[PDB]
Amino acid sequence: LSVAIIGPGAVGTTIAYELQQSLPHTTLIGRHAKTITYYTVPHAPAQDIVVKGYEDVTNTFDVIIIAVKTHQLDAVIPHLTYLAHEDTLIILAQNGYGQLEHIPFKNVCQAVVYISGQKKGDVVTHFRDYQLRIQDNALTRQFRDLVQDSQIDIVLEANIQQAIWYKLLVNLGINSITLLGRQTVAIMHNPEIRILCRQLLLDGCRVAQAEGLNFSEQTVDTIMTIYQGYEVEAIQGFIYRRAREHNLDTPYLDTIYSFLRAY
Amino acid sequence: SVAIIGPGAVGTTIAYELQQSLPHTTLIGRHAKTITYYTVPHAPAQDIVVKGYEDVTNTFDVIIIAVKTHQLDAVIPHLTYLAHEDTLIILAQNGYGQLEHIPFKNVCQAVVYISGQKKGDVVTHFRDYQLRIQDNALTRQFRDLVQDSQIDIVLEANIQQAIWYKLLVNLGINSITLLGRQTVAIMHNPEIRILCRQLLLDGCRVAQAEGLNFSEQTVDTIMTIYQLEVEAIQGFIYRRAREHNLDTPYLDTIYSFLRAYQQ
Ligand SMILES: NC(=O)c1ccc[n+]([C@@H]2O[C@H](COP(=O)([O-])OP(=O)(O)OC[C@H]3O[C@@H](n4cnc5c(N)ncnc54)[C@H](OP(=O)(O)O)[C@@H]3O)[C@@H](O)[C@H]2O)c1
């Protein structure tokens, strides 16, 4: 079984490297043929990862992992014509709820990525975690069985909706405040901010209820507790659009999204 | 004040949900340690601390014992330090006939509908948060106390109904798979299902002798639902069968093997 990983980024390289250690035919595809300096962890022996451009690949793949930014997806899709066949499993290694409908293939699955890493130039440094949460089906089980030996942790989900939406809420809270406030997590020291955070979470959590998921105020409590231990259109934009889809009243979400739209 | 003894699957689950509303709820075990709790599988992990008997210094108004039936006697001597004379003790166990072992005024058997498992120091809750208790002044007071938690307290007019119903449910499926040393997959044999019915009719005959309205329809529902603590479940029913001088051939045959295993 052949595997391709579109997107030579922090997530893409980390996945591509770990799969090449199990199934070496795993191909990392980018826009240009380049070489990426990769660290499995900080202070690890530097490794060169082969990145082959679209023009270099001549074969179709059974499993394609798209790990580009959510606003970069539309640029990747046209290349799926020659990169994929009819029954190719397409996995979106992206944040938020990706544009699943934009991809004209039968087997398209949204993945919840929990892989922390950064890219500076062509030097990718991985920090921790190798987890990918995907919807449980026959092909995602086959892909799970294939990456048995790799430390890539594939978590098959009965309903990936709950996994997707939970991370949506997590990013909704702390990342919106840190971005708009232009500070670290220490901005949560302000009592007014913490109130906003819960209200912001409750807004998104209210949208999650409308989508049919079992998220209550206790979900907010657990997420707020997580914050004590430390792509807008696809994240906040998605929660916002579904808030209008159900004609909901989410003022805190509306305000955050209004400023994030203004960059 | 509420204290839960036994940091297992049930004990931790009750502890977690009550601590959300009643922060001073104390989870008590043999020794101090940390339990890794999951509200549901694949949910974010949450730590919950446990105090040992040596660490607990005060008495509690309400105590919830959530240990195995065969582990109750080891808990009993500690109750003279963790409780006062007016303390309500709730026995969150399966089976029956163990309320007499607890030397206190307010002892109530709880029909526990809280599913989950404990692997090492990791508790994974599955579904439901229901406790069924006999209705009285103290339980009514306990129900309103935990009204803000999602612990479902169902106050029954006559708890003997729910206790024995759960007894029969345990009697039918456990006994066969336990004696046959196989999974639920053993129920595919026509002889086994017929036997499973006859075993239930035996237990139903014991329940009828105890003054319950159980009939051939009660068995039919359990057979439809179908589509160690043995001394407190099969052992209890067998004991009461002798008390009423009943002829329960299927119950005797099963229990004699289960009893022998334990020796
Ligand atoms: N810690 C994390 O980074 C983290 C954690 C959890 C989830 N995620 C999510 O996972 C996804 C991966 O993000 P990331 O951190 O890998 O971002 P990143 O490091 O910037 O990855 C983007 C990479 O894709 C390449 N690329 C861009 N457009 C392309 C195209 N049309 N065709 C082929 N390759 C293209 C870029 O190459 P150039 O360098 O030439 O632009 C860049 O190397 C993100 O959506 C993120 O939200 C990330």
Ligand SMILES: NC(=O)c1ccc[n+]([C@@H]2O[C@H](COP(=O)([O-])OP(=O)(O)OC[C@H]3O[C@@H](n4cnc5c(N)ncnc54)[C@H](OP(=O)(O)O)[C@@H]3O)[C@@H](O)[C@H]2O)c1
């Ligand atoms: N799905 C379910 O779990 C489920 C569903 C319905 C009903 N029930 C009923 O609920 C009851 C609770 O079972 P469970 O699932 O919680 O089993 P469990 O997970 O094994 O709980 C037993 C816990 O009690 C602790 N313990 C044992 N002896 C003790 C002592 N002397 N002092 C203090 N703590 C002690 C044990 O800790 P260590 O082992 O670490 O010492 C263990 O963690 C059972 O009788 C069961 O029939 C269970």
